[PDB]
Amino acid sequence: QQMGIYAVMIEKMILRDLCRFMFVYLVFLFGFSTAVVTLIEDGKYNSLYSTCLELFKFTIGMGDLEFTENYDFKAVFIILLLAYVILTYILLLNMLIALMGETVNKIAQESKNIWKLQRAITILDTEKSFLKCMRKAXXXXXXXXXXX
Amino acid sequence: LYDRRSIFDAVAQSNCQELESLLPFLQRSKKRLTDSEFKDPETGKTCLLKAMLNLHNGQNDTIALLLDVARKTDSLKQFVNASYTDSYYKGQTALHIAIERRNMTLVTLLVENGADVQAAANGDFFKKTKGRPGFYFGELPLSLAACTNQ
């Protein structure tokens, strides 16, 4: 129950929140990385993939800031990197946490329903998927509330 | 003549007539309303107790007649005080039932014909659910009468 309800949040969190942050992250990272590749003539940081990977590290927590020397008009390259970090590493990562905080507040009662549903589906299937082997097939609940 | 079955049926429908010929029967045979044969051999239920279960509008005068018969043979005390012996309702007396049913009139009547007020109903029906259940107040009439807010 504690772990299963937790897993529901991970699934809920992943597609909607993670999916949303992923799109913008790909859009920002792609744009800025392209802007950088244009910027650098040589040194293997020219390759779009290579620049893009270097740009990713900023998000991971491994960002190098000024990784490559072989660029012209140096102040512009730094401006490009500072803007990418401010909008994208800080503004996004911190935003993602707050939005995650939202999915968590709304879910939990809903995420208990989902967990309850999942056990039911697992149980229902095994008996059906259990060969419909001999199994129970009266309900009553012991009760005591007064009301008296 | 009367067997256990005969009376228990009479009681079930609050019939004070089929028990017209009752008293004189166990006068001849000198049988007692309390004999082994006049109780269910596995629970220890008596006609008075059957009467206690077969209430209609919290009323039964098979009781009044049944008691009356027991004094005329003076089965009186042990009759009004006979208890269940099965693990479930063990030690339950008619007085327990009267209270369980919130029936002053029948409490009053039983106490006046000498119901033991300290009789402990201690079977599994009077302790915490297996679930069985249920339900514990423990045991003694006073305790019952309080725990049920009476």
Side-chain angles (χ1 to χ4, degrees), chain A residues 1-41 43-130 132 134-148, chain B:
Chain A
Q1 153 106 14
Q2 245 50 68
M3 216 91 189
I5 292 161
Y6 176 43
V8 188
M9 244 108 98
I10 296 187
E11 203 93 57
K12 289 312 232 43
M13 232 65 130
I14 298 190
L15 347 129
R16 85 196 37 184
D17 267 359
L18 230 217
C19 261
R20 247 122 52 43
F21 164 83
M22 264 330 259
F23 217 86
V24 178
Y25 191 30
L26 306 191
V27 173
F28 276 107
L29 158 72
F30 192 151
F32 286 92
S33 96
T34 64
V36 177
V37 177
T38 59
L39 205 32
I40 81 99
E41 27 254 327
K44 101 231 214 203
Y45 280 155
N46 196 41
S47 179
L48 186 144
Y49 157 110
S50 256
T51 165
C52 168
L53 228 269
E54 220 67 11
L55 269 188
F56 181 62
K57 320 271 238 83
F58 275 78
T59 302
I60 300 179
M62 251 321 228
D64 203 355
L65 231 253
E66 70 163 41
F67 45 123
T68 170
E69 338 86 311
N70 77 293
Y71 59 68
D72 299 25
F73 206 148
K74 184 285 270 164
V76 175
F77 167 94
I78 201 147
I79 295 193
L80 258 280
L81 274 215
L82 262 33
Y84 163 80
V85 174
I86 296 118
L87 70 62
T88 190
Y89 162 102
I90 157 286
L91 202 222
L92 282 225
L93 261 307
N94 305 29
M95 265 252 153
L96 170 70
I97 303 168
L99 285 179
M100 273 196 175
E102 276 164 34
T103 93
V104 175
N105 256 320
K106 294 149 46 207
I107 301 160
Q109 328 81 70
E110 166 195 315
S111 88
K112 194 145 154 329
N113 297 359
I114 309 197
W115 167 77
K116 294 301 239 291
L117 207 192
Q118 281 170 4
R119 137 228 257 44
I121 295 197
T122 92
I123 302 155
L124 297 292
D125 272 7
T126 91
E127 310 177 312
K128 158 262 98 93
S129 273
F130 182 29
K132 270 113 226 267
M134 154 36 220
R135 171 63 302 106
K136 158 191 193 89
Chain B
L1 290 90
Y2 292 90
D3 56 28
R4 174 171 48 103
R5 186 25 86 205
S6 214
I7 293 159
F8 274 38
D9 293 348
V11 166
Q13 19 147 43
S14 284
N15 209 34
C16 272
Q17 267 192 325
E18 285 342 283
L19 305 162
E20 302 178 358
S21 217
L22 184 60
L23 166 73
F25 160 75
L26 44 183
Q27 281 179 340
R28 207 270 106 106
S29 55
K30 279 147 233 140
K31 280 173 152 74
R32 294 290 177 98
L33 217 42
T34 57
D35 283 358
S36 165
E37 106 202 67
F38 292 119
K39 313 171 299 223
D40 175 19
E42 50 221 305
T43 60
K45 205 214 308 199
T46 61
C47 32
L48 199 218
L49 275 166
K50 169 89 171 186
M52 286 304 150
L53 287 326
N54 301 245
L55 285 167
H56 93 292
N57 277 319
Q59 300 230 320
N60 206 338
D61 33 30
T62 259
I63 300 163
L65 177 149
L66 250 41
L67 294 149
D68 167 76
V69 181
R71 197 149 179 156
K72 308 281 194 189
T73 306
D74 295 310
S75 320
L76 188 264
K77 261 218 144 218
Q78 68 264 206
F79 177 64
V80 90
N81 284 324
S83 45
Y84 275 86
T85 55
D86 67 315
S87 70
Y88 199 53
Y89 293 120
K90 185 189 172 199
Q92 180 174 58
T93 62
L95 186 55
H96 289 108
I97 303 181
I99 308 179
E100 280 156 83
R101 296 290 181 275
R102 328 186 77 80
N103 200 329
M104 184 55 243
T105 306
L106 292 205
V107 153
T108 331
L109 188 74
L110 269 19
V111 154
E112 291 204 13
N113 305 284
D116 179 25
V117 138
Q118 295 305 131
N122 64 57
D124 294 322
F125 175 67
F126 310 106
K127 307 181 324 148
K128 252 206 267 172
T129 194
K130 260 151 45 26
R132 231 284 131 46
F135 137 92
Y136 160 85
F137 52 80
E139 316 219 345
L140 307 148
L142 210 195
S143 289
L144 182 55
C147 287
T148 69
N149 193 2
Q150 296 192 81

